[PDB]
């Protein structure tokens, strides 16, 4: 039958969402977005809960003040409608399927007393929409911005009544008032004198005195909602670098501001002079309060989640993630509690039991597409879209060598021989260039190439004499690494994204965009069988157990399936991925399964069979 594996741990936080990481007023749960789901994380007991159902990536998340309703947005395709799923918390169900916007949802806020929700739309619509909470339909709405200005970037309710929208954006500061008797919104523009600023982060106080706007010019401007006119301006000198992208108005007197360079400052507003200043790596995007405000939760744009104290400003890195897409995870030959994951700008190694970063290489902006450890464990080989193959130190992060201009359109897959002498590369043009590594030299042995498309993955026989190269032109070549030519050539009607030898090397197991797993003979390259494996979505990434009984798969269906080899029905099936799965790997101890996806999430499983 179809069982479930276990949700051990998930590592992921989409920090690109403005006002992302939140804190429920239960004081003990974090609300943070990642992929097409929202994660519940209890801080003290560390259990993960998933908020499933969104047919694209999240764009904004907000919670009600009373703390029983949660709203989220989408980044859905051009022309199609976006949706807001109005969640309740205590039983965690899809209560309502609000949908009006011809683009992406971009700002969301609940009323002080939960009666109304506001749905400031995207850069294609530019509209404000009110939805009632009791009936769960919309009441009224209008174009959010004037026709002489930009768009509106953030929206907020009042805090003592339910009637005072504030919308801000590219010079579009407006204070809207509801008129539910005749059911229409009244817009009122704001003029800050000669100032024409671009707004990223908006907030206000517990009472309705003033609302604060952090601008892209690095100043905080306080405005009086009632009289509808600017009042004070921010740090005349020492304007915050980049721009104030995350602001929160504390209850007592003060403000928390966060720049695009991570310059968390507790300021007070006759002059906005920094009283307590903290540098944090990554652009501060979300600032949330743990209740009254003795502890904070700062979500940076680099997927770093920080927890600081207001009384002394000391910092506890509690969750570090992948800020863009992941593309490969590997395990060294031996210990299974260290695994390395590559990404769009960086390679990081993780301790498994603590789920914690230990070393990060931060090669600036170029995408890695695959890594592999050497058998002796003294260098991590990495394929970049540079056309280069780097060798990073396994403990301290050093360039032992860079293989320059190796492959024309990037290097996509790498593999290392067991004798610790050959690295086999594969790139966009389809070359299977083999490089020999000595004490100080690296040489090109011979450019094996037949392919007409990218080389998705390269696997090497345990005798380091045979290798198989899955290609996206529907070809898997059994090369021959003693005399360097082709033995067998498997041809199909798909785009292989994953190939894997049998552990005692008879049949290669291939899958890809056909949604069909196939076992292939290596005598003449014939097909043994052709079984199913995805309802709708390309299957990307496979790994057999070292024993040779079961393998693991996960693809565009956001759902990992563990298959049997002699059988081939689904044995066990895990769910929880918020995006396109790119790879799956079984640990060398045959205990855990590490699955990496395209939203930036590292999920860990239990390999639930003792073989």
């Amino acid at each position: 039958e179809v069982a479930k594996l276990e949700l051990e741990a998930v590592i992921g936080f989409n920090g690109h969402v403005p006002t992302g990481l939140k804190c429920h007023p239960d004081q003990e749960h974090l609300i943070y977005p990642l992929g097409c789901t929202i994660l519940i994380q209890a801080i003290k007991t560390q259990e993960q809960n998933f908020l499933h159902g969104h047919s694209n990536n999240v764009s904004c998340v907000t919670i009600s003040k009373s703390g029983v309703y949660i709203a989220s947005g989408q980044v859905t395709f051009m022309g199609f409608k976006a949706d807001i799923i109005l969640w309740d918390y205590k039983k965690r169900e899809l209560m309502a399927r609000l949908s009006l916007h011809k683009g992406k949802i971009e700002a969301l806020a609940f009323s002080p007393n939960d009666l109304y929700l506001v749905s400031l739309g995207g850069p294609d619509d530019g509209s404000v929409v009110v939805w009632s909470i009791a009936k769960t339909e919309a009441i009224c709405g209008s174009p959010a911005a004037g026709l002489n200005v930009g768009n509106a970037t953030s929206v907020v309710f009042s805090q003592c009544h339910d009637e005072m929208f504030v919308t801000a954006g590219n010079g579009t500061i407006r204070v809207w008032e509801l008129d539910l008797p005749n059911r229409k919104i009244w817009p009122t523009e704001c003029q800050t004198g000669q100032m024409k600023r671009i707004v990223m982060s908006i907030s206000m106080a517990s009472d309705d005195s003033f609302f604060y706007l952090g601008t892209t010019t690095g100043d905080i401007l306080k405005m009086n909602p009632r009289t509808k006119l600017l009042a004070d301006t921010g740090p005349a000198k020492d304007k915050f670098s980049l721009g104030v992208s995350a602001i929160k108005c504390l209850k007592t007197g003060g403000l928390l501001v966060g720049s695009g360079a991570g310059l968390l400052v507790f300021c007070r507003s006759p002059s906005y002079k920094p009283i307590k200043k903290i540098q944090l790596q990554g652009g501060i995007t979300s600032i949330s309060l743990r209740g009254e405000g003795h502890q904070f939760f700062v979500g940076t744009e680099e997927s770093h989640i920080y927890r600081v104290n207001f009384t002394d400003f000391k910092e506890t890195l509690v969750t570090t993630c992948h800020f863009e897409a992941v593309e490969d995870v590997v395990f060294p030959f031996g210990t299974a509690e260290l695994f390395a994951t590559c990404a769009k700008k960086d390679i990081r190694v993780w301790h498994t039991l603590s789920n914690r970063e230990l070393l990060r290489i931060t090669v600036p902006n170029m995408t890695c597409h695959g890594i592999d450890f050497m058998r002796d464990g003294k260098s991590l080989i990495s394929a970049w879209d540079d056309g280069k193959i780097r060798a990073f130190a396994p403990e301290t992060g050093r360039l032992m060598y860079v293989i320059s201009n190796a492959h024309r359109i990037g290097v996509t897959a790498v593999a290392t021989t067991s004798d610790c002498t050959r690295v086999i590369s594969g790139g966009g043009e389809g070359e299977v260039r083999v490089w020999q590594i000595g004490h100080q030299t690296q040489k090109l042995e011979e450019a094996l190439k037949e392919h007409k498309s990218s080389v998705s993955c390269i696997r090497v026989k345990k005798n380091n004499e045979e290798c198989v190269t899955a290609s996206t032109d529907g070809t898997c070549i059994i090369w021959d690494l003693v005399r360097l030519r082709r033995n067998q050539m498997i041809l199909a009607n798909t785009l292989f994204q994953c190939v894997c030898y049998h552990p005692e090397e008879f049949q290669i197991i291939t899958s890809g965009t056909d949604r069909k797993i196939a076992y292939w003979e290596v005598f003449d390259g014939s097909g043994i069988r052709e079984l199913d494996g995805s309802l709708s979505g390309s299957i990307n990434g496979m790994d057999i157990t070292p024993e040779g009984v079961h393998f693991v798969t996960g693809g565009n269906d956001h759902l990992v399936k563990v298959w049997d080899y002699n059988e081939g029905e689904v044995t066990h099936v895990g769910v929880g991925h918020s995006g396109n799965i790119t790879r799956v790997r079984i640990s060398p101890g045959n205990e855990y399964i590490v699955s990496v996806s395209a939203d930036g999430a590292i999920l860990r499983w239990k390999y639930p069979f003792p073989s």
Binding site: R408, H439, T441, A447
Partner: protein, 433 residues
């Protein structure tokens, strides 16, 4: 022991020399640090220093930065001595007057000083290999002034150019015919052999045989780099027919003025066409003689082959070389000039061509034909016609004359080209006396 100094003038010269030294370091096994990992073949294009650093014998001259700065901030920053890379401060701006008269004097003394300092650390200097175009202000005027000063100071030396000629169709600039006419008029008497390479013909080669669809100039510069790395291969490795720069000099230049050969190459195959091909001696000789691997856009059948040298590189046998030459001398499509019965210079080497991470295939044989033919009379003539049509009513003449240029040198350059075409015609026809 047999060294020659490389000079790289202009943006074309700097990028071609970037590809050239990229080929040279992997040829002699030198890492881009100067160190050679663990024999006199490196002494010619590289110079030994303590702790094993191998500095190139090159002078990269450009009147404007950021092209030198690509080298100074690239992967080859430690290979070059950071003073040899010589920069100006203002772009010569496609103007021969700026290149040779006004902004050439702020760097000509420094460039000659470093030419002298590189030359003195050299026992037997074979000459100069100078890479430029007939195009931009730097690559025309500065190389004209360099030919002037090198004729004064080392007048007995050999000066071989590897020039980027303006294509008869595609071109780059409006001011191309003016600049080309002036640089070749000033450089006719001081240049001694000029190997002619045209970008549109490289385009046709890399489009037709090398299977690239959208290549930048880097592939063109690499293809020029292979040609120079195999004209200079026998003074580096050992073969059977050891040929040198002065050998090429005597063999390719019949008359004092008539010193413009075309360079052509053997297999430019891109390895989905090589395993299905013999890649023998006779067929690659035929491929070089074919009127499609010509590297300037002119028809050899619209002309006369007059003196050529074959440079065979790799596993070649002299009997097959002789058989190929005997087969070529029989076909009437390729016809020689009646007064030159010995029109072939054979030079063979035992070193196979290397492969750089690039696009050219692993081959065991290569041929460079360096051929002085009369068929480039037409290629001179179209650019002369462009010069006439643009010189009719003072187009862009004020830009020249306002910088220091005299108007009469446009004229005397035109009659010098008229005399060059007259010399080509006079050597063209068969003897009747």
């Amino acid at each position: 022991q047999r060294e020659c100094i490389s000079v790289h003038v202009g943006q074309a010269g700097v990028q071609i020399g970037n590809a050239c030294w990229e080929l040279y370091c992997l040829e002699h096994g030198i890492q881009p640090d100067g160190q050679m990992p663990s024999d006199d073949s490196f002494n010619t294009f590289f110079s030994e220093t303590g702790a094993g650093k191998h500095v190139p014998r090159a002078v990269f001259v450009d009147l404007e930065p950021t092209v030198i700065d690509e080298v100074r901030t690239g992967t080859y920053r430690q290979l070059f001595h950071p003073e040899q890379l010589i920069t100006g401060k203002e772009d010569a701006a496609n103007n021969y007057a700026r290149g040779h008269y006004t902004i050439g004097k702020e760097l000509i003394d420094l460039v000659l000083d470093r030419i002298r300092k590189l030359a003195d650390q050299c026992t037997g200097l074979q000459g100069f290999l100078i890479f430029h175009s007939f195009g931009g202000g730097t690559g025309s005027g500065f190389t004209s002034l360099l030919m002037e000063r090198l004729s004064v100071d080392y007048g007995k030396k050999s000066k071989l150019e590897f020039s980027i000629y303006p294509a008869p169709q595609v071109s780059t600039a409006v001011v191309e015919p003016y600049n080309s006419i002036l640089t070749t008029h000033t450089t006719l008497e001081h240049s001694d052999c000029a190997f002619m390479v045209d970008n549109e013909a490289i385009y046709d080669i890399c489009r037709r045989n090398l299977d690239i669809e959208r290549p930048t100039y880097t592939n063109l510069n690499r293809l020029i780099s292979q040609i120079v790395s195999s004209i200079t291969a026998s003074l580096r490795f050992d073969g059977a027919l050891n040929v040198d720069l002065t050998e090429f000099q005597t063999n390719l230049v019949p008359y004092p003025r008539i010193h413009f050969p075309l360079a052509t190459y053997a297999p430019v195959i891109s390895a989905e066409k090589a395993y299905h091909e013999q890649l023998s001696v006779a067929e690659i000789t035929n491929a070089c003689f074919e009127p499609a691997n010509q590297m300037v856009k002119c028809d050899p059948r619209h002309g006369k082959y007059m003196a050529c040298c074959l440079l065979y590189r790799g596993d070649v046998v002299p009997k097959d070389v002789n058989a190929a030459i005997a087969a070529i001398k029989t076909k009437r499509s390729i016809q020689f000039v009646d007064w030159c019965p010995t029109g072939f210079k054979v030079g063979i080497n035992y070193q196979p061509p290397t492969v750089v991470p690039g696009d050219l295939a692993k081959v065991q044989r290569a041929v460079c034909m360096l051929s002085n033919t009369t068929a480039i009379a037409e290629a001179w003539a179209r650019l002369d016609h462009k010069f006439d049509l643009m010189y009719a009513k003072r187009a862009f003449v004020h830009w020249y004359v306002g910088e220091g240029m005299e108007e009469g040198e446009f004229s005397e350059a035109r009659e010098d080209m008229a005399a060059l075409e007259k010399d080509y015609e006079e050597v063209g026809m068969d003897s009747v006396e």
